[PDB]
Design a protein around this ligand. Structure first.
Ligand SMILES: O=C(O)Cc1c(C(=O)O)[nH]c2c(Cl)cc(Cl)cc12
Ligand SMILES: O=C(O)Cc1c(C(=O)O)[nH]c2c(Cl)cc(Cl)cc12
Ligand SMILES: O=C(O)Cc1c(C(=O)O)[nH]c2c(Cl)cc(Cl)cc12
Ligand SMILES: O=C(O)Cc1c(C(=O)O)[nH]c2c(Cl)cc(Cl)cc12
Lengths: 343, 343
């Protein structure tokens, strides 16, 4: 839709992004070799995903700014900020794949898993983060929302990191203590680790660029966006298992990874002492035979029906939030995103 | 001296720092467990060093600001910014110890080497970095140099990271290609990886807080400070081997670590085809028998005498730089630091 058509101008802008970032070496050939490594890090990790978060910034910017103030310069900045979001994303993914010892990402081998990279990816990840601020300075240094965007990107990083800490404490590599897999802990992890930077950040960035720096307007948008983010992750957890790999384009590994999935949280709320024991001896195992056992326990608890019920109640709640907190912003900004998330 | 006496008020301020950072959880008990982990990360990694960089900020601030504008509030901010520098330092050390697989740091076991930590330290390191900006916001949000400090900390991180990339490309874990151990590469690594954040950052921060935001004044201070930083690292490399472990409080491991030391760079410039071969078969080995062989080759090339000559020429050059670029700043600011570095 609005994404598929705008996606072209976005992905194609990457070339200028990479150029602008790897062009400070012109004045300092001494770090040329480092800049070449940086370019390789950018091309490998910032490219290959769906660019939903970055596109949201562009899309939201056009709906929040009058068609006359949408000069080529303003649009170039919108694309850049959208790419900054993707760079923040790349920063998290590269670091996260190392921390949980992942093998692949976006279909390809994890950056750190490439021969000659390994733990050096920790520094590569840090450089991705730094590029964010280099771009903001280069393209928005003179804009009146400059400081607001810097603070937004910083806060988003902190929240994500705080959420990552929480997740690491909740599901320690090895320990399958299902006791900490509570609903309040799950919602808190989703809020900090995913919702803030995935759904609030993009619209907030667009809002600031549109001149909407009101602290109240941001609180209202955030109210709506964090709820959308929570549903998004809950749906993602559901589809991870009960989803169709040919449609989703991915195979479920949440159970095997001992993840604090929404499904496992629900299963723990709707389970008899014996059912619990069944989960403890099958959760976090590679053996498909054990995995199928967990999935079997989920269906029996009618989780797929529970999710269906939650999805309808969730949608209603989002429409109410939009109808109540959208203004003075165009409801479409939120409706467009919602429609995209809810299947 | 000015450090030993001021060091008390600095280290003692840490308690407030930790308190202020782990107090946002009061409004969000949901992340309490994460905040507890953050506190543990701070206490373990930001404490235990010499605090030279952070103290430099405090020391330089008092010499750049009139005794009347040194109210309790201004001094508290100076201490905080000095701690932000230490936090940036902690961020680099934690990440660097993982990347080069170090065992100990500041006498104690490396954070990531502690049971239950491991690669999670990558996120811990990122949180240290984030605390920097949380503190600046909390203490300097209203100050007119707020944006300048944010940009300074960001640029310093980028430079350090770019310098880290260079170092990683120069001495790949395993590859002992002595061909890339050139003087120009060594100086470039020192400049980016160490000098900028170690010697320019601290005084620059003080300068901005004192209202000295002149782009020319910063370029002049940087001119002096990067030269001091280069000598510092060259001296550090020299002492790493020819230093007295009881006085330095550390044992040399540069040769064993295949580091791009200043000594090895000099040895490569003053060596016969046969001497080179001797270095290639003994550099980067744990065997003390091989290490002693390298050290033996250094003395024979009279490197200790070369360093002595360089140290005197270096000192003269620094005094000339100070006499030429210090103004309008108090020469003492630079003289004090220099005296501290040159033994
Ligand atoms: O891109 C992703 O990581 C997941 C994802 C999907 C999706 O998987 O269809 N869709 C998204 C939308 Cl509409 C918005 C945002 Cl902010 C993220 C996503
Ligand atoms: O679990 C992991 O982190 C490693 C891993 C990845 C992957 O990393 O892409 N993919 C997996 C799949 Cl499809 C199935 C199983 Cl049973 C394990 C994995
Ligand atoms: O603290 C360190 O890492 C090394 C170090 C030493 C020293 O080792 O004596 N002295 C320093 C001085 Cl005076 C200034 C700065 Cl900025 C760093 C150092
Ligand atoms: O080289 C390393 O990175 C590990 C290491 C550390 C350390 O990590 O503290 N310290 C060492 C010493 Cl004192 C001697 C040797 Cl032969 C190796 C090491």
């Amino acid at each position: 839709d609005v994404y598929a058509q705008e996606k072209q101008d976005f992905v194609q802008h990457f070339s200028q992004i990479v150029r602008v970032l790897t062009e400070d070496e012109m004045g300092h050939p001494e770090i040329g070799d480092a800049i070449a490594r940086l370019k390789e890090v950018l091309e490998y990790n910032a490219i290959g995903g769906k660019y939903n978060r970055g596109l949201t910034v562009v899309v939201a910017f056009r709906e929040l700014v009058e068609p006359r103030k949408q000069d080529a310069d303003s649009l170039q900045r919108a694309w850049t900020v959208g790419w900054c979001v993707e760079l923040l994303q790349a920063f998290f993914l590269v670091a996260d794949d190392i921390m949980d010892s992942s093998l692949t990402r976006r279909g390809q081998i994890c950056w750190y898993q490439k021969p000659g990279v390994g733990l050096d990816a920790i520094n590569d990840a840090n450089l991705l983060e730094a590029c964010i601020y280099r771009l903001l300075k280069l393209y928005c240094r003179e804009q009146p929302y400059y400081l607001n965007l810097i603070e937004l990107f910083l806060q988003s990083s902190y929240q994500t990191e705080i959420g990552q800490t929480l997740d690491l404490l909740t599901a320690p590599q090895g320990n399958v203590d299902l006791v900490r897999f509570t609903e309040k802990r799950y919602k808190s992890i989703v809020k900090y680790k995913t919702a803030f930077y995935s759904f609030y950040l993009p619209i907030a960035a667009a809002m600031y660029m549109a001149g909407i720096d009101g602290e109240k307007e941001h609180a209202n948008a955030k109210k709506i966006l964090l709820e959308m983010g929570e549903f998004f992750q809950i749906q993602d957890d559901y589809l991870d298992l009960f989803g169709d790999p040919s449609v989703t384009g991915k195979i479920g590994t949440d159970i095997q990874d001992n993840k604090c999935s929404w499904l496992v949280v629900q299963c723990l709320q709707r389970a008899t002492p014996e059912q619990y024991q069944i989960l403890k001896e099958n959760y976090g195992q590679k053996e498909a035979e054990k995995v199928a056992r967990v999935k079997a326990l989920y269906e029996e608890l009618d989780l797929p029906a529970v999710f269906l019920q939650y999805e309808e109640d969730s949608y209603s709640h989002i429409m109410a939030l939009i109808e109540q907190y959208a203004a003075p912003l165009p409801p479409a900004v939120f409706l467009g995103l919602a429609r995209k998330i809810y299947k």
